[PDB]
């Protein structure tokens, strides 16, 4: 009877996992409708099997896991408070309902009863979707999520899901703790460890989506587009990986067109902007008193854009004119094209910006210490080939001979939501 309830709930979870196999996008418009009809049929025959064995909270946590409702399993786990997997399913029920605080309450209760992998993973989730009022509270919740995911790994080093919550957690540390590239390296390492140890981690569309979003932020566009394409193949009905893929593709199309065409600027205006370029637009990079990231006073040489090497050109400073600017919907990287002579145009990616910050066409822009990157992107018959100079913050920009204040810089924030 209880084994019949076990079979009924694993058949219902098999239906919820196999909906996109059996029905797919032709019938996944009726996703919630057909799933709630299946759960009502399972609830009915569930109830007739419960009716013999109503007393058992194992019977009622199986009923609540099938409903994974709130009042049913709340009475169940009031009857048996020790029941950790029922707490996990109940926190997942309020997570689906949107009650993040009550989900955190149930998972914290589950870890106070008995430490286990599911409660560690789910608390490490829900502490990131908890609404915060202050930044130190947000950072404390992120670091606590990293701790719960680490203990989840220490309970199961074979759990690709647990490595996925680690990848999310180190991504949140990267976007909350000053953007150390070691943390993003560890996040992508956790994603690679998940894909190495677990075959069902390959079938999760969320791991590819999050890893591809991190690759998009670190400008690995080809592996990013592979990630959104694989997530769109895994869940075609959920159109947000498709939306992210198409907006990144249209960004690459518009960007490569603007680098090739130099932003539709007529050549007389282009020569006028090149002839208006003066050494006074270097600002504080022209007197030899520039202080680098290591704190040394390094005399900079003005190097042309065409002769630069990939990586950080040490001691070099570049000076150009904006011919086009571009931003996305998501508007973390501000892109603009610079030319210094009649040669090729170079894209500049500016991160950690305020929403109102930008440069105008014709502005003299001087960048000390340029960090080159050669972009070679192939995805679904579309090819892209350009060079982008990545700068991390607008404080390293010299625009019209004037540095910016601290009001132009704001660190890009991470959002985790149901």
């Amino acid at each position: 009877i209880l084994q019949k309830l076990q079979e009924l709930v694993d058949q219902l979870y098999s239906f919820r996992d196999c909906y996109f196999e059996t029905h797919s996008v032709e019938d996944a418009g009726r996703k919630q409708q057909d799933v709630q009809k299946e759960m009502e049929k399972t609830l009915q025959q569930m109830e007739e099997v419960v009716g013999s064995v109503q007393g058992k909270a194992q019977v009622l946590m199986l009923t609540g896991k099938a409903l994974n409702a709130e009042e049913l399993l709340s009475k169940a786990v009031k009857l048996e408070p020790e029941l950790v997997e029922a707490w996990n399913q109940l926190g997942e029920v309020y997570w689906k309902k949107g009650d993040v605080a009550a989900a955190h309450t149930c998972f914290s209760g589950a870890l106070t009863h008995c430490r286990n992998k599911v409660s560690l993973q789910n608390l490490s989730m829900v502490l990131r979707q908890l609404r915060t009022d202050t930044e130190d509270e947000h950072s404390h919740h992120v670091m606590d999520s990293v701790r719960q995911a680490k203990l989840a790994v220490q309970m199961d080093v074979h759990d690709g899901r647990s490595w996925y919550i680690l990848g999310n957690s180190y991504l949140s540390l990267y976007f909350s703790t000053g953007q150390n590239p070691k943390i993003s390296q560890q996040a992508l390492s956790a994603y690679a460890q998940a894909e190495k140890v677990d075959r069902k981690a390959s079938s999760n569309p969320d791991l590819h989506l999050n890893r591809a979003t991190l690759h998009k932020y670190e400008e690995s566009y080809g592996e990013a587009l592979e990630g959104f394409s694989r997530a769109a193949a895994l869940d075609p009905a959920w159109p947000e990986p498709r939306q992210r893929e198409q907006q990144l593709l249209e960004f690459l199309d518009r960007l490569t067109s603007l680098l090739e065409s130099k932003g539709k600027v007529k050549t007389k205006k282009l020569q006028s902007m090149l002839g208006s370029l003066r050494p006074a637009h270097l600002g504080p990079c022209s007197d030899g008193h520039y202080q680098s990231a290591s704190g040394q006073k390094v005399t900079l040489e003005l190097k042309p854009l065409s002769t630069l090497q990939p990586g950080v050109n040490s001691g070099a400073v570049i000076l150009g004119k904006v011919v086009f600017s571009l931003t996305t919907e998501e508007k973390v990287p501000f892109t603009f094209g610079l030319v210094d002579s009649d040669g090729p145009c170079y894209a500049v990616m500016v991160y950690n910006i305020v929403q109102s910050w930008g440069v105008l066409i014709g502005d003299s822009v001087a960048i000390p210490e340029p960090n080159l990157r050669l972009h070679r992107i192939q995805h679904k018959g579309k090819d892209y080939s350009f060079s982008s100079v990545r700068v991390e913050t607008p404080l390293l920009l010299v625009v019209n001979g004037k540095p910016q204040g601290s009001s132009s810089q704001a660190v890009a924030t991470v959002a985790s939501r149901p």
Binding site: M125, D206, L209, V411, T413, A415, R417
Partner: peptide, 11 residues
């Protein structure tokens, strides 16, 4: 299942 977005800062 959870989704992650990364937006630019406001202040």
């Amino acid at each position: 299942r959870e989704i992650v977005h990364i937006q630019a800062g406001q202040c």
